[PDB]
Write a structure and sequence with these properties.
Chain B: It comes from Mus musculus (Mouse). Chain B: Belongs to the tropomyosin family. This is part of a larger assembly, with two copies of chain A (50 residues). With 50 residues, chain A is mainly α. Chain A is built from one helix and no strands. The radius of gyration of chain A is 20 Å and the shape is rod-shaped. The chains hardly touch.
Chain lengths: 50, 50
């Protein structure tokens, strides 16, 4: 049961590492896409201002 | 921005040519004014002579 509970922790932790690494990749990509959106929008606003 | 800025450039290119026409026509207006005054001064000299 300790192996099952610890394995549930270890496997859910690996699950977590993959989806936390995914959250990190999605977070970095969303920040990049958000900064690029802010800039593409700021370019659009700058182009609208122009 | 390009549609309006290109209209600005087209209208400006027409403007530069319309302004050039204003300068060419003002060139002629000044030339004709100089000729007008030369001929009118001759007219006045010739009124005095006649």
């Amino acid at each position: 049961k300790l192996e099952e509970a610890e394995k549930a922790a270890d496997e859910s932790e690996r699950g977590m590492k993959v989806i936390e690494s995914r959250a990190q990749k999605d977070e970095e990509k969303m920040e990049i896409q958000e900064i690029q959106l802010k800039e593409a929008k700021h370019i659009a606003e700058d182009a609208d201002r122009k | 921005y390009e549609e309006v800025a290109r209209k600005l450039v087209i209208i400006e290119s027409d403007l530069e040519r319309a302004e050039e026409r204003a300068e060419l026509s003002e060139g002629k207006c000044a030339e004709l004014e100089e000729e007008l005054k030369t001929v009118t001064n001759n007219l006045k000299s010739l009124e005095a002579q006649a």
